[PDB]
Amino acid sequence: TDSIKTLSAHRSFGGVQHFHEHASREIGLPMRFAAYLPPQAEHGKVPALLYLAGLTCNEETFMVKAGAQRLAAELGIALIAPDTSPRGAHIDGESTSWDFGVGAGFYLDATAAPWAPNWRMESYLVDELLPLLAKTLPIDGDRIGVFGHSMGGHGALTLALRHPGLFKSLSAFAPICAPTQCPWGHKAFTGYLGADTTRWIEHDATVLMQHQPVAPYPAGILIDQGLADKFLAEQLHPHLLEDACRAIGQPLTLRRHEGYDHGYYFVQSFMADHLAHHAQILN
Length: 283
What we know:
The chain has about 280 residues and is an alpha/beta fold. The chain has helices at about 60-65, 70-75, 120-135, 150-160, 185-195, 200, 205-210, 230-235, 240-250, 265-270, 270-280; strands spanning about 5-10, 15-25, 30-35, 45-50, 80, 140-150, 170-175, 220-225, 250-255. Helices cover about 35% and strands about 20% of the residues. A six-stranded mixed sheet has the order 1-2-3-5-4-6, with helices on both faces. Strands 7-8-9 form a three-stranded parallel sheet, with helices on both faces. Keywords: Hydrolase.
């Protein structure tokens, strides 16, 4: 039904890669997001995959470095990459550290000031960007999966778990699985939510997975982790999500890969495995 602004468009494996801007009312500022449309989207409504980037990343990171366009065109799936935070809020201290503020929204709604007005990434995706994707793009809104990297794997996990039925499939590259148990999570939660811990635990993939009444993704969750990853011991803790999904019977393929690190040469190397995993469920 609606339009939305186009910053640039490029032909890509027969499909179209788009970059968009819109005036967000959950965030109250202009927001940027990218969208890859495969060649099959000119004849019909295709399933889309939302990709959530990590710390220091924008809505352009994944579209340039992941190499997911080639397989999306072959599988007929759209790709949606939003930003990782609000931009142009000019809040004091929003850029003093790269682990907090700008490029570090943590896919949640901040309750504390000065962040609460604009740091509403969870509501922005769920109640604004995803509905708006069905209104403006050739997407089937009821066939969307989600995946992401580090801060964005924490986001794919926690958003999938907190909005049941919203995402049909689920993947992550090197996710922060237990944000309550790592410095990145302690600092961001303290900043955005303060110290209460109840708001903290409803934003922790491991805590939420422990209390599911049934396996939320019976088709299974796929997670790739490099063993040469600088942040694995301090920040990611995938062993704890492995124990949480065992406890409740959630099938998980957590794969550990010697030699691979945190960055996009790793993400590229397993992108094919994730696109196949999601295409098979959404198709």
